[PDB]
Amino acid sequence: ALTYRGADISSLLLLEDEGYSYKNLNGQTQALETILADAGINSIRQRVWVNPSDGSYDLDYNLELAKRVKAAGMSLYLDLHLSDTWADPSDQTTPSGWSTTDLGTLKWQLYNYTLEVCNTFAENDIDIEIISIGNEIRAGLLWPLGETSSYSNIGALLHSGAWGVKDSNLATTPKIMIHLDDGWSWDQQNYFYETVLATGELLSTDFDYFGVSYYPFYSASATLASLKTSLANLQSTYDKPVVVVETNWPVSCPNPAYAFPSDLSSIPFSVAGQQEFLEKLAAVVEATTDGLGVYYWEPAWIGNAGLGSSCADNLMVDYTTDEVYESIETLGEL
């Protein structure tokens, strides 16, 4: 089995609050984290926002969710978006209150932030397995200072965030991760790291893991073959483990905006297809040197079944019965 078989269920507290509840494969209602734990899932990814006006996914939100994750005996992977809202290649908005005019001040705020985040979990007796300094930062982070017009600033910021973690009171230092999107593209992965490391602002010793997103419905170029090559080269070039930190497969996709990759076009859109995809994906990761695992993204987000894609349903739970699909067992046993 893979070192990590995880799921990002960040939305959980928001759904439970809205009255949502789930049922195991026996139709017995039961806390989602315990349903997942028993199925084999051994790690939970949680997105963390800095100062969202409405509190969604902030530090307190994540503390409540992490408490339950620890209880169920699963590890914790904190996905720091380093923004007050969704962070990705098209939007890396610096937290309100943080600097968009002074790198010195910004580096300090980020260092203080990660230090504080880690310290707060330590004060709540919660260990952190993985923590990513940013989410999909291929186009940089904390704009404008961290735009790709300055890979030096990007490197200096990552260095600062990394050390905020290294300097924290967490008994064991969490694995520090850098996460980029389009994991199937070796050229994009390599350019980011080679360019950022070339400045000396970011040290190879500053981080531990490589994280990549891997989706099948945003481009026919996302073949398992390209992913295999990209993951293979990441480990061989930089000598660090790799992790697929985000992925989905539809149980229903009436009309995709994009053609699916060639080595995936035979997989049907159904629970069964979801299982076949996951096993085929796990195969690539397992066969890669230091391929640590796979994290499904938001398998239980009832009410947002499409999860931002052009497909109809990417969930691993039945949006009518609130009952989890058999695919959870497949993910748990990867």
d(CA 291, CA 287): 7
* Catalytic one of 33, 129, 201, 246: 246
Question: Hey, what are 149's tokens?
Answer: 């017009």
Q: Which of 63, 55, 137 is nearest to 93 (CA)?
A: 137
Q: Give the shortest CB-86-to-Ca ion separation in angstroms.
A: 8
Q: Give the shortest CB-104-to-Ca ion separation in angstroms.
A: 32
From the CA atom positions of the chain, what is the Rg in Å?
19
- Mark the segment that binds Ca ion (CB under 5 A) among 166-174, 198-206, 307-315, 316-324: 307-315
Q: Is 246 a catalytic residue?
A: yes
d(CA 165, CA 50): 16
Give 115 or 180: the residue with its C-beta nearer to Ca ion.
Answer: 180
Phi, psi of 212 (to 5 degrees): -140, 150
Give 40 or 308: the residue with its C-beta nearer to Ca ion.
Answer: 308
Of residues 308-327, which lie at the interface with Ca ion (CB under 5 A)? Answer: 308
- Mark the segment that binds Ca ion (CB under 5 A) among 91-99, 218-226, 235-243, 306-314: 306-314
Q: Give the shortest CB-197-to-Ca ion separation in angstroms.
A: 26
Question: Which string of x and - marks every residue 58-97 that binds Ca ion (by CB under 5 A)?
Answer: ----------------------------------------
Q: Which of 24, 123, 128 is nearest to 66 (CA)?
A: 128
Q: Point out the residue whose Cβ comes nearest to Ca ion.
A: 308
Question: Hey, what are 5's tokens?
Answer: 């078989």
Q: Give the shortest CB-47-to-Ca ion separation in angstroms.
A: 10
Give 248 or 274: the residue with its C-beta nearer to Ca ion.
Answer: 248
- Mark the segment that binds Ca ion (CB under 5 A) among 29-37, 184-192, 258-266, 302-310: 302-310
CA dihedral 245, 315, 317, 62 (to 10 degrees): 50
For residue 97, give Cα distances in angstroms to 51, 80, 108, 300.
9, 17, 13, 33
Give 91 or 326: the residue with its C-beta nearer to Ca ion.
Answer: 91
Angle between helices 224-238 and 186-198 (to 10 degrees): 20
**317: which DSSP letter?**
B
d(CA 68, CA 72): 6
Question: Which string of x and - marks every residue 255-294 that binds Ca ion (by CB under 5 A)?
Answer: ----------------------------------------
> Active-site residues: which are they?
136, 246
Which residues sit at the interface with Ca ion, rule CB under 5 A? 308
